[PDB]
Amino acid sequence: ANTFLEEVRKGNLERECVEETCSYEEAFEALESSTATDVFWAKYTACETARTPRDKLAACLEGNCAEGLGTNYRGHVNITRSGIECQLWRSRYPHKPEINSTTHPGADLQENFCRNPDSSTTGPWCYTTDPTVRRQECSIPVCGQEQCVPDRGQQYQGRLAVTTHGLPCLAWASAQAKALSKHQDFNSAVQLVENFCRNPDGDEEGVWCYVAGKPGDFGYCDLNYCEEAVEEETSEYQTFFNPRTFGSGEADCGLRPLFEKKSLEDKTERELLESYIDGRIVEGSDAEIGMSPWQVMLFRKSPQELLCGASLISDRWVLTAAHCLLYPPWDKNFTENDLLVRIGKHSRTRYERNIEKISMLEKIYIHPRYNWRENLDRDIALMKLKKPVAFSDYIHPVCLPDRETAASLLQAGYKGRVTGWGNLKETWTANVGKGQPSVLQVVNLPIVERPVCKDSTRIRITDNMFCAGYKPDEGKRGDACEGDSGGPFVMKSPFNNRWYQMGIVSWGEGCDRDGKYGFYTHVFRLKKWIQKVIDQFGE
Numbered sequence: 001a002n003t004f005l006e007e008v009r010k011g012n013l014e015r016e017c018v019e020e021t022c023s024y025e026e027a028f029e030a031l032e033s034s035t036a037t038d039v040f041w042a043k044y045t046a047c048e049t050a051r052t053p054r055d056k057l058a059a060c061l062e063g064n065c066a067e068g069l070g071t072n073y074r075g076h077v078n079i080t081r082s083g084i085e086c087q088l089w090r091s092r093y094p095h096k097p098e099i100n101s102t103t104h105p106g107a108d109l110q111e112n113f114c115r116n117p118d119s120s121t122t123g124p125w126c127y128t129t130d131p132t133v134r135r136q137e138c139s140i141p142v143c144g145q146e147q148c149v150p151d152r153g154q155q156y157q158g159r160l161a162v163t164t165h166g167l168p169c170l171a172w173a174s175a176q177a178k179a180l181s182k183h184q185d186f187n188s189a190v191q192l193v194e195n196f197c198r199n200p201d202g203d204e205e206g207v208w209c210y211v212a213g214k215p216g217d218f219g220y221c222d223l224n225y226c227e228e229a230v231e232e233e234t235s236e237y238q239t240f241f242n243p244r245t246f247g248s249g250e251a252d253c254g255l256r257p258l259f260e261k262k263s264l265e266d267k268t269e270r271e272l273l274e275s276y277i278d279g280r281i282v283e284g285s286d287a288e289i290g291m292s293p294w295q296v297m298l299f300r301k302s303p304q305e306l307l308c309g310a311s312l313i314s315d316r317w318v319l320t321a322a323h324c325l326l327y328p329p330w331d332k333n334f335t336e337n338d339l340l341v342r343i344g345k346h347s348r349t350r351y352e353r354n355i356e357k358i359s360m361l362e363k364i365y366i367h368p369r370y371n372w373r374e375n376l377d378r379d380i381a382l383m384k385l386k387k388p389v390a391f392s393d394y395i396h397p398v399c400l401p402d403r404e405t406a407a408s409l410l411q412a413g414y415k416g417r418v419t420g421w422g423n424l425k426e427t428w429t430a431n432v433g434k435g436q437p438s439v440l441q442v443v444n445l446p447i448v449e450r451p452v453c454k455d456s457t458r459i460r461i462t463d464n465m466f467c468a469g470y471k472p473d474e475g476k477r478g479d480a481c482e483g484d485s486g487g488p489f490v491m492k493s494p495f496n497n498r499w500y501q502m503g504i505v506s507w508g509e510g511c512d513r514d515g516k517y518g519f520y521t522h523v524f525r526l527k528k529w530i531q532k533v534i535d536q537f538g539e
């Protein structure tokens with residue numbers, strides 16, 4: 001920096017180029033030689049994907065942590081991801097290198113320290129003494145992994161320009177991103193710089209940016225968000241989405257046609273208001289007619305087959321889980337023409353031709369930051385139907401809550417509802433008890449404390465999942481594996497009688513050991529994502 005005076009003083013790399021960002025000549029004054037160097041303007045410019053405090057740069061510049069997929073690295077991790085001894089760069093046993101210390105003399109390729117000369121999208125790596133293993137990535141702790149970007153990075157100032165899926169964020173700049181995506185406008189506190197990831201429209205799922213492909217395409221860039229759980233956080237219903245791309249159905253969701261419109265109460269909906277009382281433990285039962293009218297089935301074309309549950313949020317749009325449509329482990333890649341939704345069925349098999357409508361989908365949006373390789377993180381999917389579905393007493397959409405509203409609910413409700421034809425037991429276990437159920441069952445379950453559900457699992461719970469089910473005991477027993485894969489978990493509000501979907505059934509560890517819970521994907525986060533995916537329309 002150059003705050004007026006201070007140029008009487010001799011250059012300081014730390015004060016000036018490390019404590020503050022900088023320019024070429026400030027650098028020079030400080031430097032003794034005009035080595036505008038290579039991997040040293042890169043000691044700077046590969047370190048730009050870092051920009052937080054005195055340290056994140058010093059840590060980066062003194063090559064101790066990896067920058068993004070960091071060809072900045074110059075540490076001493078002589079080992080692999082598994083833990084194989086690293087082969088010396090200078091060697092040819094067991095593997096004769098293609099990339100010696102001349103091909104890539106920019107990079108610090110000496111001894112046997114993990115480096116990233118060629119830039120692996122897996123980053124810093126090394127040659128392996130395990131002669132069957134040529135190269136392999138190395139487990140380096142990354143820069144200020146201990147930092148925690150907060151508030152989904154509303155504040156975020158730094159400069160990432162590619163997404164999780166590694167695409168280049170187009171600059172907000174453009175004649176379409178600005179002057180043809182002007183249609184939607186933002187929070188003007190958030191400085192949009194070129195094409196660096198930002199969170200203008202206050203999205204709950206993190207930062208993002210427009211991308212190439214279809215107009216309004218986009219994705220969420222990778223950043224290490226703080227653990228901000230809603231569970232640790234109106235008089236009636238005001239509408240959220242634009243009803244030209246959502247379809248109508250919104251301003252009138254969650255009020256059931258054959259109940260909340262008839263001032264009639266359903267057989268276990270009392271249990272839900274009276275959420276505090278140490279209830280007896282009510283099991284599943286054949287639901288009433290038109291009790292969950294946002295219910296959706298997801299039918300595979302040939303052969304006939306019931307894949308998953310899903311839910312209806314409007315005339316057009318149908319919500320389910322990502323893993324339902326796409327799962328490389330079961331070699332699963334379904335597409336818009338393989339799939340049919342049966343909206344508002346009651347039997348598992350019969351064709352309720354007076355009643356249910358069946359539909360083709362006009363495009364299937366798998367969720368942007370969905371990933372299974374680790375652990376079904378962000379297991380979410382959105383589908384638009386080839387024509388608005390006409391409502392009635394059997395079909396009628398649900399309400400998707402903001403955070404503030406889901407926040408409200410969990411404060412007051414301590415139970416929710418899970419319905420389906422028990423497809424989760426069907427997909428994910430051998431289902432060796434009594435067979436699949438004959439009708440759309442219904443049950444109510446308790447929500448568990450975030451900590452309980454956290455230390456109730458070897459697995460890990462992001463601030464984006466949640467758990468349900470009574471905690472197994474000798475009469476306080478536990479069947480957890482309830483509901484449909486990719487289905488709804490709803491709660492009813494005692495402020496507007498409306499039914500919100502709180503979660504999306506995912507895979508439960510509580511499908512194996514008697515002692516676990518059903519895991520659910522919080523739907524409060526989703527709005528703005530949905531907000532962008534709809535807006536990519538007009539008709």
Ligand SMILES: *[C@@H]1O[C@H](CO)[C@@H](O)[C@H](O)[C@H]1NC(C)=O
Nearest residue numbers: 076077078079084085086111
């Ligand atoms: C890597 O080499 C250094 C050389 O001092 C040594 O301290 C370290 O123990 C070595 N580790 C392995 C796995 O070879």
Ligand SMILES: *[C@@H]1O[C@H](CO)[C@@H](O)[C@H](O)[C@H]1NC(C)=O
Nearest residue numbers: 096097098099100101102103
């Ligand atoms: C470095 O490896 C290349 C790759 O084939 C090899 O041909 C060459 O002999 C090596 N470079 C030098 C300068 O010896």
Ligand SMILES: *[C@@H]1O[C@H](CO)[C@@H](O)[C@H](O)[C@H]1NC(C)=O
Nearest residue numbers: 326327328332333334335366
């Ligand atoms: C699944 O198949 C489609 C159509 O053949 C293909 O374009 C695509 O590569 C696959 N999609 C994914 C997400 O793997």
Ligand SMILES: [Ca+2]
Nearest residue numbers: 001002003016
């Ligand atoms: Ca200064």
Ligand SMILES: [Ca+2]
Nearest residue numbers: 001002006016
């Ligand atoms: Ca200065």
Ligand SMILES: [Ca+2]
Nearest residue numbers: 011026029030
């Ligand atoms: Ca200076």
Ligand SMILES: [Ca+2]
Nearest residue numbers: 001015019020
């Ligand atoms: Ca200063």
Ligand SMILES: [Ca+2]
Nearest residue numbers: 007025026029
């Ligand atoms: Ca100067």
